[PDB]
Symmetry: D2
Subunit: 209 residues, 4 copies
């Protein structure tokens, strides 16, 4: 509010009590452990997919969140608009690390399911995921016949789950998996940004890009 | 390189010697001044347009920067792919402020020119720019018949030029205009990021989104 | 208040709109200018003098600020307790720069005046200030016969005044001198910390030590 | 080196991979646990004692570190110069928390031992430590008849050890105690600052003051 608010060195040096980690520290923590299943949220975790959601909002519901309940939007979103989604560097590093380990890589999303989807292909191509490590995207939710993110983590015996939202971390917590937080980019159109670290979970440094 | 690099409070509090400003401070600095021409770079200044450039690179030159010399790319980029570009909040605030002032708003881009372009329309629609304040995008460069960014600033008597690149700031400097820097987002695909403040220019706080 | 408050990347990257400068930038800004008078506040500007004020508070008024009105305290403070005051690196660099320029160096303090003082000697010795550049400490205030910081800046034609408090900056402002802010260290016992930059003034980077 | 180095938003948001904690999180982690022995380093952990070391250096060895081997210095340092040492807020909070728990509070220092010492009294008085929780300062080292910091932690069954130096953390590590790092203030005269977090240990947020 003030024109010249100023600052002080206590504020400049102030740190939130967050357990920050690096990809290297995560890899070290898994040293010796045999191949296992690991999981990733998609949106704002491995892909900056705001471009599609932004276009979707403008096209189908400029004045509300109704586009997210619109099957015409989801068809477009899941069948080509991820060509405009920008893969995150943190995800390249994590996926490379887990492939090097021989881990099974799963993607678990809350996106609404569609007749067909090319998201799995986009992910395998962009992250250079060998077919042997790759698994088709799981569309999780509370719709009839679906299973929740938590149930899927149990089902696939996923030991580590990476995600940007509170629900991603609590999904891991509910089933005894290690939930590791990725920072949502500040130019995401999905606001407010989550409070990374709100469950005392590990948060990956510099993971906004 | 070290697994546990650590830190110290000198590093935590360390500030680069940058002249940071707010939109409110810029507006205050213009108090009383009659309507004038102001200018904006487009990419990473008012639009996060990486989604289109990313798709362009993958489609036309996955292994080089050749797509930027490809007329087929520019046709797509300038005639619809900005529907996936995400308008920056800092730009909403600056444009609103300048419209409130009754200023003339110009956009000056180094994008290659095309037969037609719908970028001007995208900008007017997204930033709610009244027709009276709006001007068609200027495609500047060193191609025969073109004029440089600097020459256009002179031609239109642009008094303030906002941009994210070194060339934007030096364009303003060369003609005695006030060059004000916008931060390029860290998830931009245009790397390396510029050193904002490298010419002692004003840099807008929090302008990465 | 929350046990795990978390954070987000907007907050991590957030900058206050402050005009930060370096000693090198200040020196550059004075390139070519003939020798002139410059001035420095003492406490939390050139000396971390909290050790003496802390000891003074404990000894003379553990339950109030009364020690600051006590002549017995000021005698001790001004005649030897600065042997425990720690010279600030930013002050070493500024004083060296101004001595190199051939500038006259003044110190202007709001400390209560005493029969004798050895502060001037402490400052000349610690900052290696040549006798030709050195001037005895000015004890400024609103006591009968005293002059204010502002009046002294006028009297000595001080062109630049360095200080950590709001009153230092406004003293410079009132007389048309360039007021430049030094950050008060977060372990100072003089609290709350000032809002450096609250008058749109230049603030020296990393100047807390 | 450059006059206008600039910055970018990747650098502005960059975080070191540090396990930051708060006093509240430490207290929570000990919920339910019976009274136990805990330990604190003194210098730059609970006291900003640079004022005395600075005065000592100037008086006994202005041109070297020889003052630290001088018995005349240690007599002064350990028998009154801590009246100028400034207690750290983080230490007030930790000591209060541990006293509330009914824990035994130990101080373990590498300061050279002297005939008498009033440091224990300074600590009990300043931190309001009840006699029942207080223990005389342990002077640890590798001098004949002394025991090392590590040996003392073992001897007193100290379960948590707080300190600012690498040697403090490794002392705890060597005996299976929980070593928790405090940040050394940037205006300390003991340089270089340690790399807090260099052993993957917990580091207390904002603990420089
Ligand atoms: Cl960012
Ligand atoms: Cl600090
Ligand atoms: Mg997500
Ligand atoms: Mg970003
Ligand atoms: Mg640009
Ligand atoms: Mg002061
Ligand atoms: Mg220590
Ligand atoms: Mg400090």
């Amino acid at each position: 509010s003030p024109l010249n608010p100023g600052t002080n060195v206590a504020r400049l040096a102030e740190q939130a009590p967050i357990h920050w980690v690096s990809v290297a520290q995560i890899e070290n923590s898994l040293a010796g452990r045999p191949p296992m299943a690991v999981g990733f949220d998609i949106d704002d975790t491995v892909l900056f997919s705001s471009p599609g959601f932004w276009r979707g909002k403008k096209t189908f519901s400029p004045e509300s969140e109704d586009y997210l309940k619109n099957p015409v939007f989801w068809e477009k979103m899941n069948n080509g608009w991820d060509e405009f989604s920008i893969p995150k560097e943190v995800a390249r590093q994590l996926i490379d690390m887990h492939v090097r380990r021989g881990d099974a890589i799963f993607f678990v999303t809350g996106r609404s399911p569609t007749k067909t989807e090319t998201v799995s292909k986009t992910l395998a191509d962009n992250f250079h995921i060998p077919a042997t490590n790759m698994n088709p995207v799981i569309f999780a939710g509370d719709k009839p016949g679906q299973n929740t993110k938590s149930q899927w983590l149990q089902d696939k015996n996923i030991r580590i789950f990476y995600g940007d939202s509170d629900n991603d971390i609590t999904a891991a917590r509910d089933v005894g998996a290690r939930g590791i937080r990725i920072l949502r980019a500040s130019n995401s159109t999905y606001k407010p940004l989550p409070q990374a670290g709100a469950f005392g979970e590990e948060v990956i440094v510099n993971s906004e890009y």
